[PDB]
């Protein structure tokens, strides 16, 4: 299936039956569907806490680091987990959510205190 | 292996009418102030521009109302002055408005630019021509308006990763790594595009 | 904001001038009666022509007419045709146009003086070989397929009538009218591939050749024709 | 100014001699086939016209030349032969008609040219008319010129002689024409009209907004009208000559008459032009008295001042007339060429 322009995209790839996402960092092209064919499988990942309660993922950086060195673009997901590791810059947008977050914190737990 | 001809014809019919009689600039770039919708298309326009369209005039508009569309006349980017205080401009050089205009309000026309004071020895493409964005600037006041005037730390896992990599190596090299930032040149939103690159219906 | 406007002059000493035109309606036949019938007939048709303008035409002219109908979208009916005849003298004169569309060739007769008939325009004015195209039927349909909104050929204001010296390829020989003889001096059909020496040869054996050199059948019209125009200027006048 | 306005050189310079009926049948299949044409045709035909009737096919001519597939070209020359089949015909309300509505038509006289036709607007003794026309030339802004002193004179009569009260176009005209024919920076009539020009479009500006200031009109976008001319003002005291006139009266009507008692394009931080009413009063009564402390006889007649310029006017009409001749001498060195140029098809065939 030769699409006609298009890139290369590292992306996310779901798996596992419902109620049991499970991610696997992968190279395609931008035209692949969601869990269509890739050419390299490069990593996986589990948004579910295990036994221990931390959570699994699997980065292959020579690997990656020759695929964008031949040239893929990233998807906000997986870049934001990339940034979240540390091999890559953290990400605005995160940096936002979190200020946000402790905002509304700040917020409620003032209210709180307004109401007691 | 049995050819096919009636693909071909059609593709060169297709491609030889379209070039023909494909749609006007000005007729596809006209709008309807009283609903804000270009004929041809029957799409809306956007809500930060719903008020320029409905105010300001086209940069073919301005330019009909002097001899010559105005050569090298001031015809600066609204958007770029209103997102910088700095002056910024366009050296047009060539100009070809389109004649099954009525008011003669659309066309193509550029030449060289400058963008902070960044001249470029190229006469290249204006970039958002239809825009009702334009702003004319007379030759007086012209002078005093045309006047103008390293490193970040790698990544922890990454300068890890170097560390381990160069004490394997056997050097020390305690310096701390690091790249050239000043010959990245991150560009501005508002860097103009090539016309050409960006078809049309 | 008004729009353009178009205009031709041409002026030409020994060129533009071209004299009198008359109309082949107007003059009466052969046939014996009273020259009060042609006259008055010709005033009324005259004082219906101070309305209505005839563009004049010829056979071979094509003609883009609208009429009122009373059983039409809007109540009017637009067709363009060729000119093959005009026919009838007086009021009932007609004239007859074709034109083949989807693959049918149709004909109609236009009355060119009932009221029934809005306005008439030239599209394109030249004259043919032939008298009479009625042999276009039998003719291929592509000499016969026009435009339905093809734009009028403007003529210059005073000129001579254009005169296509060209020829017309037919259908093979089963023809209604046997065109082929010489009775009917025709020109514009091709002999040389629609049959052959032989069947041309057997066919001018009806020719006759008298009937040109015979002078008291033919219709002097000179003097006719001169009080025709007197009258004609004489109620422009009045 | 009769030597001035006649030029025989120009109707006994290169006529062409073709006849307008084939040029016009040229012309015709030319744009029936919509291929682009040259502005040769249209310069013959227009040098040959010698009649109304020929005149106005010429006038639609035009139209279909403007809205032929070539438009930039634009050449002044035949810009002014038409201008001068027109005006020796003297079409008056089609001539009007063709400047109020160049949109349509596409004319842009040169000094010269324009200079001829305002002369002969004064020996028809017409006002309207040339208010329109300078109107006209104030959406042009071609004021660097020898012309400017008729547009002055033209406007300070005009001005004066109007005699109308509230109408928003007219008044916002006025104060709009009144600034670039000062911009010559001569004298008191000069920087005073200026200020005049700065008050009235304040004055525009505070009873219909800045919208109308600048969206059928090319100005500058800065609201504070009145703070520039005080600015002049205050900067005209510090510094010459100052022949004043009571148009100052009508300043101070404006000012105090503002002062008695949606899209928003002002910005938040900056004050708002209705709440600077009072302290732009304040100011400009201040800079009132520190003139009057300070040239303020109030006397002398604008329009009569450029009776004085007449001087001067017939001064620098040499050098318009000079600059005409040159120009002439370009137009029938750079002519010829193309006349050449229009045989080498007919070589070439
Ligand atoms: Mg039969």
Redesign the interface.
């Known amino acids: 299936k030769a699409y006609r322009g298009g890139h290369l995209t590292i992306r996310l790839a779901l798996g596992g039956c419902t109620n049991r996402p499970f991610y696997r960092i992968v190279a395609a092209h931008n035209k692949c569907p969601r869990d269509g064919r890739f050419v390299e499988q490069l990593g996986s990942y589990d948004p579910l806490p295990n036994s221990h309660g931390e959570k699994l993922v699997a980065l292959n950086l020579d690997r990656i680091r020759h695929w964008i060195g031949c040239g893929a673009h990233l998807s906000k997901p997986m870049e934001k987990l990339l940034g979240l590791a540390g091999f890559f810059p953290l990400h605005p947008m995160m940096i936002t959510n979190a200020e946000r977050l402790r905002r509304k914190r700040a917020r409620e737990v003032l209210l709180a205190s307004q109401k007691t | 292996v049995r050819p096919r001809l009636i693909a071909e014809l059609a593709r060169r019919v297709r491609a030889l009418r379209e070039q023909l009689n494909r749609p006007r600039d000005s007729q596809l770039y006209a709008v309807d102030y009283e609903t804000l919708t270009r004929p041809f298309s029957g799409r809306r326009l956007p809500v930060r521009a719903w ?1 320029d369209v409905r ?2 005039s086209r940069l073919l508009q ?1 330019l ?6 105005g050569l090298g006349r001031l015809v600066t980017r609204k958007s770029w002055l209103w997102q910088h205080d700095e002056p910024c401009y366009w050296r047009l050089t060539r ?3 389109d ?2 205009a ?3 309000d659309h066309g193509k026309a550029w030449g060289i630019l400058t963008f902070k004071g960044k001249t470029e020895s190229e006469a290249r493409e204006i970039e958002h021509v239809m825009y009702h964005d334009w ?2 600037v ?1 030759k ?2 012209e002078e005093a308006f045309t006047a103008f005037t390293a490193s970040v730390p790698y ?4 300068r890890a ?1 170097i560390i381990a990599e160069r004490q394997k190596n056997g050097d020390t090299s305690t310096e701390e790594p690091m790249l050239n930032v000043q010959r990245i040149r991150m560009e501005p939103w508002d860097y103009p595009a090539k016309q050409e690159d960006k078809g049309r219906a | 904001q008004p729009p353009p406007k178009p205009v031709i002059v041409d002026k030409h000493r020994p060129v533009e001038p071209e004299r009198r035109f008359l109309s082949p309606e107007f003059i009466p036949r052969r046939g014996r009666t009273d020259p009060l019938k042609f006259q008055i007939e010709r005033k009324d048709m005259l004082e219906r022509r101070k309305v209505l303008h005839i563009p004049e035409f010829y056979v071979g002219s094509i003609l883009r007419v609208t009429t009122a109908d009373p059983y039409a979208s809007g109540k009017i009916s637009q067709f363009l045709g060729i000119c093959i005849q005009r026919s009838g003298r007086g009021l009932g004169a007609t004239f007859i146009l074709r034109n083949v569309i989807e693959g049918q060739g149709v004909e109609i007769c236009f009355e060119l003086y009932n009221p029934r008939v809005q306005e008439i325009q030239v599209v394109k004015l030249e004259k043919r070989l032939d008298d009479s195209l009625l042999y276009l039927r039998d003719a291929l349909p592509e000499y016969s397929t026009f435009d339905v909104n093809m734009k009028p050929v403007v003529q210059e204001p005073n000129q001579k009538v254009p005169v296509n010296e060209l020829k017309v390829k037919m259908k093979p020989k089963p023809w209604s009218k046997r065109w082929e003889r010489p009775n009917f001096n025709i020109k514009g059909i091709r002999f040389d591939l629609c049959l052959t020496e032989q069947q041309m040869k057997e066919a001018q054996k009806w020719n006759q050749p008298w009937l040109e050199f015979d002078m008291m059948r033919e219709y002097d019209t000179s003097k006719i024709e001169a009080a025709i125009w007197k009258e004609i200027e004489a109620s422009k006048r009045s | 100014s009769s030597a001035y306005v006649d030029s025989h050189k120009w109707e006994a310079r290169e006529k062409e001699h073709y006849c307008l009926a084939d040029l016009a049948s040229l012309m015709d299949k030319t744009f029936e086939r919509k291929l682009p044409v040259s502005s040769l045709t249209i310069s013959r035909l227009i040098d040959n016209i010698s009649s109304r009737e020929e005149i106005d096919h010429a006038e639609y001519y035009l139209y279909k030349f403007r809205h032929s597939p070539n438009c930039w070209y634009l050449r002044n020359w035949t810009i002014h032969t038409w201008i001068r089949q027109c005006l020796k015909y003297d079409a008056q309300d089609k001539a009007l008609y063709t400047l109020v509505n160049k949109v349509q038509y596409g004319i842009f006289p040169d000094n010269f040219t324009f200079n001829l036709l305002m002369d002969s607007f004064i020996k028809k003794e017409n006002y309207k008319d040339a208010l329109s026309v300078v109107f006209e030339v104030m959406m042009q802004e071609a004021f660097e010129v020898p012309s400017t002193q008729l547009l002055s004179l033209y406007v300070l009569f005009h001005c004066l002689a109007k005699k109308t009260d509230f109408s928003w176009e007219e008044e916002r005209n006025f104060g709009a024409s009144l600034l670039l024919p000062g911009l010559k920076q001569k004298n008191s009539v000069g920087f005073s009209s200026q200020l005049y020009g700065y008050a009235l479009l304040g004055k525009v500006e505070l009873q219909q907004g800045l919208r109308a200031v600048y969206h059928n009109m090319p100005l500058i976008w800065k609201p504070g009208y009145l703070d520039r001319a005080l600015q002049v003002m205050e900067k005209v005291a510090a510094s010459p000559e100052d022949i004043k006139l009571c148009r100052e009266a009508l300043d101070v009507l404006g000012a105090v008459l503002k002062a008695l008692t949606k899209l928003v394009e002002q910005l938040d931080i900056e004050e708002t032009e209705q709440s600077k009413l009072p302290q732009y009063l304040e100011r400009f009564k201040a800079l009132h008295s520190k003139l009057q402390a300070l040239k303020i006889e109030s006397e002398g007649l604008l329009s009569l001042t450029t009776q004085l310029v007449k001087e001067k006017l017939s001064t620098c009409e040499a050098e318009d007339i000079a600059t005409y001749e040159q120009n002439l001498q370009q137009w029938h060195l750079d002519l010829v060429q193309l006349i050449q140029r229009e045989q080498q098809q007919r070589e070439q065939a």
């Open positions: 008020a105010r300001e301005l009909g109302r002097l001899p010559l569309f100009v070809r408005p004649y099954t009525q008011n003669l702003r004319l007379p007086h006041e990544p922890p896992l990454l990763m």
